[PDB]
Amino acid sequence: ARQGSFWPVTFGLACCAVEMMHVSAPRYDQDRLGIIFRASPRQSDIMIVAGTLTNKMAPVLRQVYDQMPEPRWVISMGSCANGGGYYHFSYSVVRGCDRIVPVDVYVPGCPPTSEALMYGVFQLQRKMRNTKITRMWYRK
């Protein structure tokens, strides 16, 4: 059930958001999988950070991250979003969102393909298929 619906909230900062909305394009559709994102951080599950991440943004990003329910994950979409990427040597850029939010699936490269974002999504769902939360209540 958690692996099926799986909607994000767009944070969507730059070019990598143009590829994100290309996943909403009809070629590599989100809704053939279930990805129907709301624009609201409480109604969300995972928080795709796409685009580069400024120094100026990062407190707003962590404040969005905190008002988000407990089964939460983060996708770092785009090379700039993880390890700073193509700028990384600015005064005003954050050297990767690992300095801000904990991330569970990275997505490489300036703009990663719509193929790439969906492959990261399926790898995240493959991680979800090993969450084993109920038998971890049983303390396996």
Binding site: G4, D31, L33, G34, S40, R42, P69
Partner: protein, 340 residues
């Protein structure tokens, strides 16, 4: 006593399972209308997405320090109880002759469709945010202004009826296919029907991130599935309500079933079949109606609050008062009034 509780369980599981798969249905038909494919992956075929999404979004449940939980933990349950479900108390042509309702139909549906509006308003009352409650007052104001011209038109179509119990409209309408063939203000009822249950081309208080990254409150968790299910269930109820009075139940092949059932069955074999085709008639008159809702979701964009109140209190309502300056007039002219 046992037969009626299993009756009511069959009808509740019909409406609940119905409104469950309706969201998958509309998303599919938007998707083909948007030249793509809808939920095509979930489990066993791809008919199952909402039925997994309900189990998904239960297990979130946040609360907000800006607001008492005691109102928002109940106000989406309010419109889930009253707006969604006990509108079906009228059994809005539970599509046979019979219902699960005694009598005095249409104004009960009026009262409960009226009762949903401050379920929306007190929902938007929450969180004490000076940018939020004005949007709430906006939503509720346009909501009541189109409630009024649902009300003042389905009280004038029953001027061809005059009987207030539920069935008598339906047995009256089988002679003419009275519903739309004598009057096409169905369409303005239809354009009223997108507003009083806002699943609209209006989307007006769903200024999703125009406010501080939240539209209604973002009461996610069980109140989210409550609001979601009640909005869709209000849609299929008011769509049935359109197919109740101003669109017709009891399709004319059952009128021709005099030339069919007399050629099919001998004498009353447990009434085995006619309720089924009657249900088939009402169901195909209902889903074909809401297919136009799913059109108008993805055909025309949002509708600009000041122009929306322009669209209520300036144009449609004086046309309306003309139209029941003539429907009392024209039947008085041509021959005469209806009895009850």
């Amino acid at each position: 006593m046992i037969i009626n509780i299993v009756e009511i369980l069959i009808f509740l599981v019909c409406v609940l399972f119905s409104v469950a798969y309706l969201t998958v249905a509309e998303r599919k038909t938007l998707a083909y209308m948007q030249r793509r494919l809808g939920p095509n992956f979930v489990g066993y075929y791809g008919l199952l997405q909402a039925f997994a999404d309900a189990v998904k979004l239960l297990l979130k449940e946040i609360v907000l320090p800006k607001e008492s939980n005691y109102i928002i933990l109940v106000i989406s349950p309010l419109i889930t109880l009253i707006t969604a479900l006990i509108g079906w108390v009228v059994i809005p042509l539970g599509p046979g002759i019979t219902l699960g309702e005694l009598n005095l139909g249409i104004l009960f549906s009026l009262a409960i469709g009226s009762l949903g509006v401050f379920g929306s308003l007190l929902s938007g009352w929450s969180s004490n945010s000076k940018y939020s409650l004005l949007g709430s007052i906006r939503s509720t104001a346009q909501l009541i202004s189109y409630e009024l011209i649902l009300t003042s038109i389905f009280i004038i179509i029953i001027m061809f009826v005059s009987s207030l119990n539920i069935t008598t409209i339906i047995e009256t309408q089988r002679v003419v296919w009275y519903c739309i063939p004598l009057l096409p203000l169905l369409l303005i009822f239809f354009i009223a029907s997108v507003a009083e249950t806002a699943r609209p081309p209006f989307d007006l208080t769903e200024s999703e991130s125009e406010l501080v990254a939240g539209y209604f409150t973002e009461y996610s968790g069980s109140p989210f599935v409550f609001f979601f299910l009640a909005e869709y269930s209000n849609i299929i109820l008011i769509s049935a309500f359109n197919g109740y009075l101003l669109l017709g139940g009891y399709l004319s092949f059952n009128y021709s079933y005099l030339f069919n059932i007399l050629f099919n069955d001998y004498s009353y074999v447990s009434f085995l079949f006619e309720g089924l085709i009657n249900s088939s008639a009402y169901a195909i008159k209902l889903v074909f109606l809401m297919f136009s809702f799913i059109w108008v979701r993805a055909a025309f964009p949002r509708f600009t609050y000041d122009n929306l109140i322009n669209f209520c209190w300036i144009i449609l309502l004086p046309l309306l008062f003309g139209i029941f300056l003539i429907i009392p007039s024209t039947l008085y002219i041509f021959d005469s009034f209806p009895t009850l």
